[PDB]
Amino acid sequence: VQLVESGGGLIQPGGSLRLSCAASGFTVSSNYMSWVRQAPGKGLEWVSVIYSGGSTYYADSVKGRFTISRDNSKNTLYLQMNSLRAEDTAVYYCARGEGWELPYDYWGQGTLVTVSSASTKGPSVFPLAPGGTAALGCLVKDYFPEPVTVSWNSGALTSGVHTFPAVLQSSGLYSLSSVVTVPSSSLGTQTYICNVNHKPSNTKVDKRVEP
Amino acid sequence: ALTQPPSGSGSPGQSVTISCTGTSSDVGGYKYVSWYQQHPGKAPKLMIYEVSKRPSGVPDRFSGSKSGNTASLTVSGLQAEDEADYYCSSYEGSNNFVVFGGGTKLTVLGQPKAAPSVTLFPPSSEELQANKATLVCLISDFYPGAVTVAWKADSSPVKAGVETTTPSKQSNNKYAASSYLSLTPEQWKSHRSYSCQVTHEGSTVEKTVAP
After folding, report:
1. CATH code matching the domain that covers B7-108, chosen among 3.40.640.10, 2.30.36.70, 2.60.40.10, 3.30.70.1620
2. Reported CATH class of domain B117-209
């Protein structure tokens, strides 16, 4: 059984977003499926359910705004979310079952929905640098929204890489850092490039780090 | 609402019991109590359903019960991997209304103490040319998760312009955190040095950088 979600993103209050949950290993059209959400740093909240015969139910806080449905030929579950509010910001999970007679044994991986009028802002990337060893890094500064991911040398360098959790600044923008320790002899012999991917702004920044 | 204590703790090999209290309308009224285990960054995992039933693959040392309006989850033979947030859920008897408790964070005592590694970076040339300056203090590989970060200009404490993350466990099951100090270019160039000092379990680590 596999459940693979997509569709999350940043949306302004009052806007609309459609989430998808692609399933395999069972038939969505003959099963019970639910949406459950988890607000940042908080607990789980049931959102909606669709029964095997097509009956639907919703939590009171989303009724009239959210609609659950499914596409039998695409074996996919959807959540149409209209008139979004800041209170709807959460990771949304799809799960097979209805939460009581059919408990949530199988879950999707979650998709992040951020409801805010703040602008999307791509990061500014700065180098972190000084025989022996050298700690090299990149400072990924002032971006929004999450997530940013960092690769090194287009993914070919993984050993010794540590990318730290982001900090939320008082400005409301995020920053994070990624670091790798290398032999100082390899500087000027080899090239170290951090690849900073910010899918919310469709941008990747490649910064060569050299003392 | 389902009421769960926010925190629980036990030492390895022992037992712990987590409670979840509600009303005759949910826990006391039906046999539809479920328990979920959630690790940070992961979807919840079903541990118990219909009060006391275990799904396939869930070890026998997890057991569920209820008495009156209170449901209980017992973990015997506690192991480090049981460290997680545990959520109880119940059906409320109407319109598929499934409620979750607030979750109980279970800590397993006895993991070895580990001192933090600290790397401190000065501001980059390109950031200084943008009329900005950030010092970056990266803290990793420590246990337990509580650290105190102090920034110093020369020997004098600096509290303004500091942003520090909440420590979180990395893949090695030890904690990492970072601290960022914002300075003007003039402050950076006009002091002999800046230091990041990290205090942890009565021991101190400090690094120093200079223009």
Report:
1. 2.60.40.10
2. mainly beta
Whether chain A has a CB inside 8 Å of the CB on B208: the answer is: no
Degrees (nearest 5) of the Cα angle B59, B49, B31? Answer: 140
Q: Chain B residue closest to A112 (CA)?
A: B41
Give start-end residues of each CATH 2.60.40.10 domain in chain B: 7-108, 117-209
Contact between chains at B34 and A165 (C-beta distance less than 8 A): no
B37: buried, middle or exposed (CB in 10 Å: 19+, 13-18, 0-12)? buried
Tell which B residues from 9 to 48 touch A, by Cβ distance under 8 Å: 30, 32, 34, 36, 43-46
CATH class belonging to A2-115 = mainly beta
**Beta carbons within 10 angstroms of residue B179's beta carbon:** 22
Resolution in A: 1.8
Q: Which residues on A lie below 8 Å from B126 (Cβ)?
A: 126-127
Query: What type of residue sits at position B148?
Result: T
CA distances (Å), A171 to each of A147, A197, B184, in order? 17, 21, 17
Q: Which chain A residues contact residue B95 at CB under 8 A?
A: 57
Q: Do B24 and B66 contact (CB within 8 A), yes or no?
A: no
State the structure-solving technique: X-ray
In this structure, is the dihedral angle defined by the CA atoms of residues B181, A164, B138 and B149, taken in order, positive or negative? Answer: positive
Structure tokens at A147: 């997530």
Angle at B86 between CA B40 and CA A51, to 5 degrees: 95
A124-208 domain in CATH 3.40.50.1000?
Answer: no
Which residues make up the CATH 2.60.40.10 domain(s) of chain A?
2-115, 124-208
Q: In this structure, what token pair is assigned to residue B58? A: 């869930």
- CA A208 to chain B, closest CA, distance in angstroms equals 13
* Cα–Cα distances in angstroms (integers) from residue B105 to residues A91, B4, B16, B158, in the given order: 19, 10, 12, 34
Specify the DSSP element, H or E, that contains B151. Answer: strand B148-153
Identify the sign of the CA torsion B76, B80, B82, B86: positive
* B1 neighbourhood in chain A, CB within 8 Å: none
